[PDB]
Every structure is written in C-alpha cells, then in structure tokens.
C-alpha cells in the first residue's frame, strides 16, 4: 500500500547526503601518523579546479553512510544431541569453517558442548572466531575497555565522538547490540550537550538524524541548523520528519496549510516541537537578521 | 643577544718562520645563527685561542647570509651540490623527521632554525669546504612563491596524510598561464644510484637508520 522509507531509499540518502555536508578541510584532516616529504606539482587554474574535483569525489566516498541495521535475532540452534558423549569432556569445542571463498555470515560455526550437544555458535562466539582466523585491522577478540560507560564519557568530555565511533565501527557489526548500544549513546551525548557540529562531513552524521527522527527528539538538531543559517537543512529535516511521521499533528498542519520552506519549521514548532518556544524564538531571530541584510 | 655562536673546528697553525723557527698560532672555524634564518660562518686567526674565537664570531655576524625555509622547519626541496671536493645531499623531511646529518651540519642548522632534514656529505670531508658548501646550496635554494612566478602555475602540495586534497602552497602574483605545463612521458632528471639503491631495498648498510639521541 504505502511503505515507509528506509535509510538506503534514493530519496533519504540525498536528503542526508545534503544535511551532512562536504568539508575538504575536514574530511582530509591531516592524520597523525608517519611522515613522507610531499610531492609538488605545476597546476594552471582548470588543473587545480579538476584535482579539487577529484578530491570531492573521493570525499563523497569518504562520507558513504553506513546502513542502519536492526538488531540481529540471538542465534540457539541445536544440530544434534548425541547424549552419549555426555561427561566425556570438560570443555567445549568450537568449530569455525575456514573455507576461504564464504562470506562470514554464511561460515558454519558450530559449538560441540560437554553435554554432547552440536549447535550453532552464538553472534558473539561468531564475530570472535570470525577475528582469530580472519583477523580484520582495527578489531579485537577481547572487546576493548573504552567502551565501558566511564571511558566513554572520558571520550566524549574529550569532544571525540567521531573517535568513538570510529572505533565502534571497527570493533562491532552493524547489527550487533554493542554496536547500536554505543551509536545511541554516542548520538544521545551530542543531543543533550548540543555537538551536532562533530558529525558535519562525516558518515555518522546521517545515521545520527535517521535516530533522532525515528525516535521524535529533532528539537535539538533543528535549533543548531537555524543558528549556522542553514535553513535549507532545518527545512528538510522537517520535511523527513513528516515522511517518517505522516499520520502526525505537524505532518497533516502541513497538508492543510499547504505550508512550505520556513513556515514547516513554524508549524512543526507548534505541533509537535517539545522546545516550540525556543524555535520560534531562534526562528524569528534569523528572519531579522535576513531582513537587516536585505535592507 | 639573538644570535648562538658555534665553534666547528680549532685548529693548531705551525709558521715556519726566518729567525724564531717553529711558531705556533691558532686558527678557528664559527658559526653564528638567530634561528630565524640568518645565520653566517667566519675564520678567526690568532695567537691566542680566544682571540681567535672573539674575531671569528664577531666578523660572522656581518656576513649573514639568510636561508629560507619551508614551514620554518626544513628546506623547500632536495639539494644536491659540490664545494671542490666536497659532495652535500640534502633532502627535504617531513616534521619529526630531525636532523640526521653530518655533525657540523647539525650545529649549522640549529643555528638557522632547520629541525628536519637528512645530509649526506661525500668526498673529501673538509670542514670549511662543508660549511662554505653547505651555506652556498642553502642560500641557493629556490622557494615555492618563487617557482610560482616564474612558471605563472599554482603551486600544489599533495600530502599521503590529508590523501588526495590538494594544498595550493604558492600562486604567482603575475597573470595565471593557460598552456598546462608539458607532460614529458619520461623526464631526463639524473639520479643518485644511492637514493635509488635504497628504494629498490638493495642498500644493505649496518650503520644506515641506527638508533640515535634526538637530534
């Protein structure tokens, strides 16, 4: 009949690809690691117009957003329980296939219980043997400590989110439950203290709106967008939030105002805004602003 | 009161002369620097050892030369040259790198404010041709506004760290040239057998990348 979009639709990508932004300076940050001499090169003004092209490219790359994944269902399945190899050993053991050509989420891995019991390894067992025998860079088969709620608040003191995720990316799957544990709490951290400007030109910044949107709390995003003058984003986010929203206050006020550009931003306010005073207010102060510079 | 002085070499000058037979003099090699880019080297030459150094520092601070550098950290780009018989290479470092050369070179270049770059000096290792030599290639060196304006072309620094973003470092103040610059498909540059031994993992030496105190 009529579905609602999902985080991969054509239509939410280019939304959030415009939300995020694209900073040069920003997305190639120069990293902390060793050194070679750089290399020089003659450009003429279409020469270097093409090598900053290039270089967008390379940052909308960069900047792919990772999909936003549901949290995968415990994995208890039982292949067979031979109960005659009950109490014949202490310590199970666990069986990972190490075909080379199988993608890891279709490697048999099986654990032989002391019970006699063959099952399937668990999520965890799994993405821990995945690592013994197909080592990924930047994970580790004992789950670092950084992501203990007291470090992570050392992290975010710090203003390093994006190093949180960061590291929660290379750590976690998509799906697993630490990896969205950590996203939510990480987004729920930039929310209260008001950080949306660490995400900006990083492929976390989508996927922050997309839980802000779905979880009906984008007072705070929309409040940052209107102070740096970027309506069209706080116009847009809006705009998501009533096609995730349809059957809602602000998303019919809409419907029957016919309301576009700044006025949604007026109607979500009133709707369905927690902090509607506080935007009003921050809207009104940017259209004085726009009035004493068109003037 | 800006400026370091550095001694390079004292040496022990014997004069045969016609009634006093062997007479024994001094004479001394100094640098002097502010860090800043200027820098200068004197001989001093007397019969007292301090005396020797008093006229060599005093007359370098009047021969100053000024060494430009990139970043006010390194050189802005390899420098290859001979003084008589003595051979210098020079290649530009990133920051961290420090100074892993010669000795002397290492005094030199703390007196004109370099923290990184890598000498090689061959031949015959004479200090003063080494100072003299080392001096004339560094005030030589052509800087990135300079190379600007005299190809009319941006100037554009790729770095590995910040990836493919380009870091246009110096544009000419004169008109901008249309004509790319020409794409020789093989250029006709001469190379150091060294540099290219040590790429291709054929340079075999126990003393090469040791262990050092931060220079």
């Given at each position: 009949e009529t579905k609602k979009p999902t985080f991969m639709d054509e239509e939410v990508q280019s939304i959030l690809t415009k939300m995020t932004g694209l900073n040069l300076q920003k997305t190639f940050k120069p990293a902390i690691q060793e050194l070679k001499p750089p290399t020089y090169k003659l450009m003429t003004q279409a020469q270097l117009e093409e090598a900053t092209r290039q270089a967008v490219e390379a940052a909308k790359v960069r900047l792919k957003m990772p999909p936003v994944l549901e949290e995968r269902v415990p994995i208890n399945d039982v292949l067979?329980?031979?109960?005659?190899?009950?109490?014949?050993?202490?310590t199970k053991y666990v069986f990972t296939?190490?075909?080379?050509?199988?993608?890891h989420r279709e490697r048999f891995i099986v654990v032989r219980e002391p019970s006699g019991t063959l099952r399937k390894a668990s999520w965890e067992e799994r993405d821990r043997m995945i690592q013994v025998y197909f080592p990924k860079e930047g994970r580790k088969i004992l789950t670092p400590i950084i992501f203990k709620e007291e470090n992570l608040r050392t992290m975010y003191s710090q203003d390093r989110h994006v190093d949180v995720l960061n590291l929660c990316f290379a750590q976690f799957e998509p799906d697993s439950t630490e990896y969205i544990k950590v996203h939510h709490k990480t987004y729920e951290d930039i929310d209260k203290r008001g950080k949306?400007?660490?995400?900006?030109?990083?492929?976390?910044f989508g996927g922050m709106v997309w839980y802000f949107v779905n979880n009906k709390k984008i007072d705070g995003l929309l409040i940052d967008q209107i102070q740096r003058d970027l309506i069209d984003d706080a116009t847009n986010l809006v705009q998501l939030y009533h096609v995730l929203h349809p059957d809602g206050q602000s998303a019919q006020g809409a419907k029957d105002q016919a309301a576009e550009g700044i006025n949604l931003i007026k109607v979500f306010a009133k709707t369905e805004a927690q902090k509607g005073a506080y935007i009003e207010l921050t809207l009104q102060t940017y259209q004085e602003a726009l009035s004493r510079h068109s003037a | 009161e800006d400026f370091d002085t550095r001694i390079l070499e004292v040496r022990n000058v014997f004069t045969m002369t016609a009634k006093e037979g062997r007479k024994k003099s001094i004479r001394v090699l100094v640098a002097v620097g502010n860090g800043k880019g200027a820098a200068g080297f004197s001989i001093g030459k007397a019969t007292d050892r301090m005396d020797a150094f008093r006229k060599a520092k005093n007359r370098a601070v009047h021969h100053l030369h000024y060494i430009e550098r990139y970043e006010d950290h390194t050189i802005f780009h390899d420098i290859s040259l001979r003084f008589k018989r003595t051979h210098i290479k020079m290649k530009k470092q990133p920051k961290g790198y420090g100074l892993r050369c010669h000795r002397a070179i290492i005094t030199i270049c703390r007196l004109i404010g370099i923290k990184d770059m890598y000498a090689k000096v061959s031949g015959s290792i004479n200090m003063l041709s080494l100072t003299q030599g080392l001096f004339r290639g560094l005030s030589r060196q052509e800087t990135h506004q300079q190379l600007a304006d005299k190809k009319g072309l941006h100037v554009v620094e790729i770095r590995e760290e910040c990836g493919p973003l380009p870091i246009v470092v110096a544009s000419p103040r004169g008109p901008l040239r249309k004509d790319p610059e020409p794409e020789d498909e093989v250029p006709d540059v001469k190379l150091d057998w060294e540099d290219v031994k040590t790429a291709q993992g054929m340079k075999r030496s126990v003393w090469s990348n040791l262990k050092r105190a931060a220079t």
């Open positions: 067979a329980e031979d109960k005659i190899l009950e109490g014949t050993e202490t296939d190490i075909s080379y050509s199988i993608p949306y400007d660490l995400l900006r030109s990083t492929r976390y | -």
